[PDB]
Amino acid sequence: RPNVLLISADQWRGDCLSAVGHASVKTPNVDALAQDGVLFTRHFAGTAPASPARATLYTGLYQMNHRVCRNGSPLDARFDNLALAARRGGYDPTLFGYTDTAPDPRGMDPNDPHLTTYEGVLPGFSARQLLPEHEKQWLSWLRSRGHPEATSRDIHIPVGATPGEISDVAPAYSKDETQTAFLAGEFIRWLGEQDAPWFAHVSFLRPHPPFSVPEPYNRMFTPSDGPAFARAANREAEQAVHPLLAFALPLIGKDSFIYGGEGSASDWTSEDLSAIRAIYYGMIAEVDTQLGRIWQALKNVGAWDDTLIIFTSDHAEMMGDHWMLGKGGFFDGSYHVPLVIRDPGHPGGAGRQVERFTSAADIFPTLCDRLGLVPDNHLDGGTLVPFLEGGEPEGWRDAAFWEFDFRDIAKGEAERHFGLKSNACNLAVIRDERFKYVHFAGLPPLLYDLAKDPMELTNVAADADYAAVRLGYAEKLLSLRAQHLDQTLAYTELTEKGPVSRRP
Amino acid sequence: RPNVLLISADQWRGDCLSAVGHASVKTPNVDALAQDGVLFTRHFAGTAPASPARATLYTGLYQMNHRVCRNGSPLDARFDNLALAARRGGYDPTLFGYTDTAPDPRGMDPNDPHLTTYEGVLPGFSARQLLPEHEKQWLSWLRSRGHPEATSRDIHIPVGATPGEISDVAPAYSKDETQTAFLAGEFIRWLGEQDAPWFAHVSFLRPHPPFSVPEPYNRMFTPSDGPAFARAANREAEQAVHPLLAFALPLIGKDSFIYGGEGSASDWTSEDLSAIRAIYYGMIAEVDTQLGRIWQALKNVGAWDDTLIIFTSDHAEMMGDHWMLGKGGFFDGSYHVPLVIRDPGHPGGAGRQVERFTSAADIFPTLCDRLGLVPDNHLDGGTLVPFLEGGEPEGWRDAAFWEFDFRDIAKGEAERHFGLKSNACNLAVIRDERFKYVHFAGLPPLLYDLAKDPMELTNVAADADYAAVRLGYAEKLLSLRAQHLDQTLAYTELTEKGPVSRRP
Ligand SMILES: [Cl-]
Ligand SMILES: [Cl-]
């Protein structure tokens, strides 16, 4: 019955929405969706980076169940997902962009090109417009628009600017020529062809790096603007808190954030990071405008009040916090993501803001509930429908839970550095309103008193006065571990009258 | 190349072997196997009751991975096991007795009789002689031996004795007519037909209850004999230690231990339990005799020095300890099991006794190593081959690990009583030489100082002086949970050159 529109925009911070009180950041179209919908203020990714993070999103599972530890980790073919379930509800789930699903290699022919990347399409989606890392479909679209220069990703370098340098200058393409504008247009054309209830997933790359954007967004924000950075006085002191920080922070490269970047991101100053943030803030504004354009096209076709809109991000961005750029680790900056759900079918909950901890694992259970679908296996998340109704679900979680795995199957760098097996190269986070407890399978734990230290700069795990707090969170995490074991078959019992099952 | 003989005898205590220094118990044939083999002194079941315990044994997985929680919990069809692997090594794995495998109901026709019981056969085994709970095959064999009275399981009631009463009188059948004597004979006939390397699993019911045995075993031991019972002064003080004990202990029924038993086992006195133990000790002797008959049969055909023998039990028996009878819970009595491996291929370890912690989860990895087989998925156990070689494996575990789940899918009794969801009706045990830490997903934890309290009667979890010990074991258990997550696909990374994998 309703149309479903799942919109994701990569690497977008949960605190970077004007609707949540950001000083600098301007998100009017997200705000507009939240005015008529439910905004989730404590929404966390299941994990990081893109492939592990998206496996939570699409399967409704914690990394302890989906087992997608890194970009390139296969996702078991046994797992149900929102695309496959959508089809059991009579929809044809359609993709615009990417899912970053490494397929299950088992049984697949060794010569199959699908075995060579993590940039595969999630089973169940029908691809209308694909757009991988190579962006060849966008480049060819630019060529058809009068850009014979659009022959490579080099087109991302701002006009006249030095390759690999932070620049406020706009690239050769316009604001109506970004990958965002391209994908939105492709969605809008497809939307025009619809004559029945539709299911679409639009996956925008931006505000994910390279950090370059056309006019006006490039200069829309001043480097001096923006909130304080949640960081230690210096990089050395920051890294001294935990072995993982000492290992990971020096390895962050410039190439990952600026097109043509060379060397360590450690060579960028507080000023350089502030300049990057100004561009990032503009990039968020560019995606927001495109969302407005999507809202209008929905109204124009008369879909607006028949469409369940879910806007979110896979994982977020550190953006200078803790002298870091990118995703991964255990800090809030990398995991706290936006979530705005506009359900015209539940007007009761319109205008509301939810302060209960929510997970990316909750999206698939929400869709199942709302669309009257039954998942084919255990799910880790819970339905958000009671929050959309304007109420609160019974037995809801009281802390955010997420995981991060830093194993290296291909090169074994982290394993050699730490002197650990690949199965001990991980952490689990339990985070509520007062504390953050990080447990590492093979490194020391971390405990942050968010009341005293909201910036997470003081590890109090070894302080004797926090010993009982540390023990409490360790045992809470132990119950979470035990409760989230796979219940796919464990909720069934074979009796004399045949199988008997329980509903979660 | 070698023959494989996996022998299991249900509900046999690890301390009940004369080779380990038991005062009363007489196990000469197990001792004889151990004299020429490796005996494992700290061997623990992966879990209990029979179906959960056997899933660890056959799949080399901890319950956190196989998810077989209760008798009736399905075992996922995706899992590899010692019988499927044996076929990949050119063997025809043959079964005598039972595996207690509830099949994966998915895709199976709802009218299939296999969906009505947990007493299914493990995939990969070819059944030579089946013997389920109904024992109809043994009853018909008795009829053919001149027992027209053998028309029902009533034949287990001792001659003249009152049904449901502890009796040291022998039943109508002889020592050469037990289920043990029947199955051993069937194995011996099959053994004679072998002309190539063979793979057999002989699964004996005894010393599992009803506690009745023919002459001489019935009176071979005096109730007054036997070691001290590891129990509190009374049942009430026992049950007061933990909510699970207060729930479970009153529910133990007489029918589960004596044929025709009625009412609670709480109505049995210290004397009654000592009488039951005397019969149990005799039942162990009856099984040991049949092992000697098997060892002779192997010598007679010339297989003895070409056969890898693995003798063990699925789980143990409480046998009066903690005022309990049967299996389940968290006490040692229910999980410490025998393990004797005779490998003629490794004479370098013969006569040896191993004191490191071993698991039922280690059997399948051991067979894979020894027989040059590769498992099709992640395994939780480790190869015991380095111990058979006469050495020690590098990076072996410092503590025994086991789990127990008490959910009730069919009736929901435990769930209602405790006010817990089915996913929270479980515990995990971490047990070393000095401490036992039992964490419950939804009940209070337990901490036993085995150095001061080897009988497990004093819970010190709440004592402020043990706070750091409690924290240490909680974080150690957290590390295990993270390391034992499914690595089937997580040890693979999809690269430009295709898949790249790591070996555990
Ligand atoms: Cl600032
Ligand atoms: Cl062979």
Ligand SMILES: [Mg+2]
């Ligand atoms: Mg991403």
Ligand SMILES: [Mg+2]
């Ligand atoms: Mg058993």
